[PDB]
Structure formats: structure tokens, C-alpha cells
Design a protein around this ligand. Structure first.
Ligand code: GRI
Lengths: 132, 132
């Protein structure tokens, strides 16, 4: 070709979503349950789960320990194909008994569509909604 | 009738990384600059950028406004092909003259290799680190 397209560095993508956890074992168990998936990389302080493409979601005990009382300003979002899927997942999580699932917001409509919020063991906010 | 017996729900993936922002237009400009990409969609309150694959990174003014000095317990991560790419990006971002970038931590080798930290306009932590 005549196409010198690789002279400006690698692409810059927010391909990691990382949350600080108090205990990696407990959070690994929690996210295995939420995602119905095994992690792709496991170490005692850092565990990664797949996202789309080359992106990852990771839990890490090397940051600052989360404090329950402190308000949070970001969310771990899970986009499902349809609004029916959102309601089915809410029903599944709130009916099953083994795993504690803390509901923060009941299903409602927001900018995302039909959506609900739960908390993880360290107070991280998880949103379920439809695909864009 | 149906010839399918699969009763599984849809794949559950953390495919939305969402942060709360005070000034959507300001944050749109910031992220357009650091990602060198246009948003997928823009509304007054809600803007998304591509992450990898089908995943998105989004900014939203409809949550709770982030407050300076409230500690944060999560990071927006940017994973690059090599450690050398990490140092090169820090040089690029600190050399350019057109956008203020607040540096939290200059480059160094952590337990996972070369890394640095910056802040976004609303105090969200952004980490640059290596894939490998
Ligand atoms: C923020 O933390 C990380 C980011 C990206 C990584 C790339 O795979 C990564 N890998 C690790 C491998 C071993 C141990 C740790 C640890 O932090 O103890 C790791 N932490 C990592």
C-alpha cells in the first residue's frame, strides 16, 4: 500500500475497569456468581474477568480499602439484550437464597431504559440495563 | 415447534464503565482528547465512547455529582501493548500544551510493571498500565 497509518502510537482505549476490594477471595466468589463466568487471570491480590474485545474487569486488594459510608461516583454496568432480560435477572438474583445480593434500587426507567442497582461486598455500585 | 433445548439466559458481561460527571461538555472534550476518539452518542446528560469490542465507557450527570476530596475506590484503566508504551504516553500527555491534565503519580514500576495515574476533571482516577 501507500498507507503509513501506524506512526502515531497505540490506540488508547479504557479497556480496564478496576475496583479496590478488601478481600480478593470473597470478591472473586461474588463476581463468579454475578457473571456466571470464571476469571481469566487469578493471583492472590489481583483477579481479572473478561469484558468484550481485549477489555477486562478486575478486582484488586492493592488500592485503598473501601469504606462503606463513603458515597461512590461510578458504576459497573451490565448491558443485556432486552428489557425482559433485565427483569429476569432481577427475579433470579432476588429469589435465590445462597448468595446475598443487596438491592440498592428496584427496577425503574432511567436514561438507559429499564434498570436496577445492586451493591457488591465493598459497596461498589452495579447497574443492570439494556444494550444501547 | 422449537428444536432448541438451551434454557440459558444471555451472557452477563461488565460491558459499561460509567462515571458521574459535573460538566458533560467539559468531560466530553477531556475524553475525546485522551482517547483520540469521537463519542458513539451525545445527549445533554449522557455521553458514551467506545471501549473494546461492544463495551462502552460513559459519562453521566444524572447520578450524584462527584465531590472533590471524597476518596475514590475504583480506577479507569488503559492497558497498552508494552511498558515502554506507558512511559511514551506519559511523555506525550505531559508535553502537549492544549489540555490541562492533573497528574496523581508519575511513571514507575509497580508489581505489575510500568504505570502512572492521572485525574479526570471530576477526580476519577485513570491508570495507564501494560497488558503484559
Ligand atoms: C492494578 O493491578 C494490576 C493491573 C494490571 C495487571 C496486568 O495483568 C496486573 N497484574 C498483576 C499480576 C500479579 C500481581 C498483581 C498485583 O497487583 O499484585 C497484578 N496487578 C495488576
Amino acid at each position: 500500500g501507500s498507507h503509513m497509518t501506524d506512526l502515531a502510537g497505540p490506540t488508547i482505549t479504557p479497556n480496564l475497569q478496576l475496583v479496590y476490594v478488601s478481600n480478593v477471595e470473597r470478591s472473586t466468589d461474588f463476581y463468579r456468581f454475578i457473571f456466571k463466568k470464571e476469571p481469566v487471570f487469578v493471583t492472590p491480590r489481583y483477579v481479572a474477568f473478561p469484558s468484550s474485545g481485549d477489555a477486562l474487569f478486575a478486582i484488586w486488594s492493592g488500592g485503598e480499602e473501601p469504606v462503606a459510608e463513603i458515597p461512590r461516583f461510578s458504576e459497573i454496568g451490565i448491558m443485556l439484550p432486552t428489557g425482559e432480560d433485565v427483569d429476569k435477572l432481577f427475579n433470579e438474583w432476588t429469589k435465590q437464597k445462597s448468595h446475598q445480593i443487596i438491592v440498592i434500587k428496584e427496577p425503574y426507567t432511567d436514561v438507559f431504559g429499564r434498570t436496577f442497582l445492586i451493591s457488591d461486598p465493598d459497596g461498589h455500585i452495579i447497574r443492570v440495563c439494556p444494550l444501547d
